[PDB]
Design a protein around this ligand. Structure first.
Ligand SMILES: [Ca+2]
Ligand SMILES: [Ca+2]
Ligand SMILES: [Ca+2]
Ligand SMILES: [Ca+2]
Ligand SMILES: [Mn+2]
Ligand SMILES: [Mn+2]
Ligand SMILES: [Mn+2]
Ligand SMILES: [Mn+2]
Lengths: 237, 237, 237, 237
């Protein structure tokens, strides 16, 4: 099976797989059963921003999510990612709907990876920033239902022409280039990701959420990972 | 045939294909016959730096090369790259040797691409920086004789274990991710590339040079493009 | 007198000092009488973005301005700024009103300056980005009527509490740190500025505009530089 | 008295003020008596690099120092800098010698400060990078014995023309612009500093070290802060 590290914006509480009984931000290490969550005051129809930060000195994966005119939600977990992830990875966004549904719209996505060595010429770096997506976005691998180009946005899950979200949808977008998160001469390794999203549902109960994920390079959508499994996990172990 | 835009650091004057009678920096638009050159005081065994800049407002491709304790060489050409290159490209380094030979060693390589749209959320961006290369550099496509990992460097052409360069060698390295250099809503499109190189030869006449290139995404080494053709062109038309 | 280089977004045509008979983008070298203009389809009450670019290799000062859902205006002028500006400068925004008036609101401002030397350790750099301004913005020098903190914005000219602009107003904001735009070992010197602005007037004829400017470090608002002189020039020579 | 947060590269063990009995990297919160140290294998005459990182989510100040062909030293301390430092600060390098002496040479210095707000337009940023210093570096405040321009370097402490360091010297360099490290709408605040240094002494026992520091904006060299007090503290409380 794939190896997954993710920050989930989980819109629907599934309490039998350990979700708290509210929308929440979570750190997922190789399981949909978050190692840590915080309450998330998700706003149906409002544009949000999530920030994800990590470094190999502090070995702490941290996330913050907010809306304009609102407080943030934040969550941290002590994990050494060198011990979880291979040396080379791909980074991605995943989203799903089930019998409950929402738009999983991404208006922007940026990622920065930095390896500082002990050489006087320290810094290796990867940085991308998407504020506009095109119908043919060749530096993304789209998986399952994901599409680009609708109002210059990334639609991770299925949306009708009417703008209405579809249930039982799963899609992901991975950056084309493998990312080097560990190197033998690196003294400091860090990454930062940001995405702005619009989760809208005609229903009082949207589902199921958006995740920023890091994976083995060859990661694909696990069979039957609609709904609560977020296109990340083959099961809820 | 492939579509090529390159800045050549041409170490060997081939006067029958229009080289001036000295080492020179050149702008190559779809031909090894530079649209413009400047005299280059190449130094056998010294670490050099080349900078390449362009923007869609000025439509001018410019390069500067220098060594520590030395003057620069610079060359400019008015070209609109939207009229030459497809919307999506790959960016690369190429090098060759012929019957005359040199090391084509790259110690570092960086590239920045920026598309600013008329949206209030203006900037799309790609940035990579290599100061260390590893034996398995998965974000590079190596072609022909190119290898990574020897003293943390990129060797574009064949080098023996003794450090001695081999003749009749051609190799390239392309960044894995396609790069988006034109987009319909872009008001300003710009790129910057930098590489530091070490061209060393036991001979008074090194050959044949290093180029930074932009190409169709599916670009490969043209048959018989050792020596004066720099791994860029199938012939000298 | 001060030494001024500016890109003007000139909202009011003053044809006796060479303004074309429409709102226009201009390059000002040591005179309010632009060395080049382009027609600007200014939109009363809409949020705009201007981009300014320059490099010491091409010696071309270029600007682009746009609104969402609208075409850009662009203007270029060949000038070597090493021949106009001292080695050390300050960079700023200026705005004015006269008997005709407008808000000169700045929602964001960024600037990047880069000096690449012939040393293997090439890059000197300055970068700032403001997306929020506070009541006490200590890294800005505010001059004349300029204030910060109203709805997290920079108000270059006087606005009443009702949001109504005042006439006969002049204000500027300069970044606190002097900027080094020429250095003896520099092989490439470049800068990029971006600002997003909101020019709103209850009148069919707003005045007088916003400028991004570079100056001697000790620059101050010239006496009587309200209206058509944009807080930049003591007169219209 | 001034308010100081510093990472010290302490070259001389003063065991009566809590130094361990070896050269060491330390975190100094308002006292020369480090809140945490790690053993530092300082190399007389070799060019080193220190990296300093912090963020307001993890509230952990971390540093790494290394040489080429050598292991790193690292040190971390949990501190919330919003509780120690004012909203506005200056950032600096300090160095001293006493009766034991060393060169306190800086070949390069960079700093990045980022405030991400809950606004859709998230990022405020300051970034500077010095790889070359000039005799008149107007974006630095030099204090005590500090000078710029000798071989394009920053000399924090007194050096004769022969290159020989002087004892009983103290000097600092602060970036000219105040830096905004806390803002009321900020959801994430982070900084990164890097400097490369050359500590050389004709003696087997060099003294006293280099520090990266953050201070009240009006910070000056405390009276009698040569030697073990590093130009940071008026005493060893
Ligand atoms: Ca759930
Ligand atoms: Ca040739
Ligand atoms: Ca006018
Ligand atoms: Ca000490
Ligand atoms: Mn969950
Ligand atoms: Mn040639
Ligand atoms: Mn005008
Ligand atoms: Mn100490």
């Amino acid at each position: 099976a794939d190896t997954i590290v993710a920050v989930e914006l989980d819109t629907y509480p599934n309490t039998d797989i350990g979700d708290p009984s509210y929308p929440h931000i979570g750190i997922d290490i190789k399981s949909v059963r978050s190692k840590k969550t915080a309450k998330w005051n998700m706003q149906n129809g409002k544009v949000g921003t999530a920030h994800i930060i990590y470094n190999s000195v502090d070995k702490r994966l941290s996330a913050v999510v907010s809306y304009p005119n609102a407080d943030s939600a934040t969550v941290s977990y002590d994990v050494d990612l060198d011990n979880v992830l291979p040396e080379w990875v791909r980074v991605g966004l995943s989203a799903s709907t089930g019998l409950y549904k929402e738009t999983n719209t991404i208006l922007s996505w940026s990622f920065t990876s930095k390896l500082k060595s002990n050489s006087t010429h320290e810094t290796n770096a990867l940085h991308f920033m998407f504020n506009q997506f095109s119908k043919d976005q060749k530096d993304l691998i789209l998986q399952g239902d994901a599409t680009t180009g609708t109002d210059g946005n990334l639609e991770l899950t299925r949306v009708s022409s009417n703008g209405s979200p579809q249930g039982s949808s799963v899609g992901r977008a991975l950056f084309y280039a493998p990312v080097h998160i560990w190197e033998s001469s690196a003294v400091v390794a860090s990454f930062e990701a940001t995405f702005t999203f619009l989760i809208k549902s005609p229903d009082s109960h949207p589902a199921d959420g958006i995740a920023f994920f890091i994976s083995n390079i060859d990661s694909s959508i696990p069979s039957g990972s609609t709904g609560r499994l977020l296109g990340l996990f083959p099961d809820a172990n």
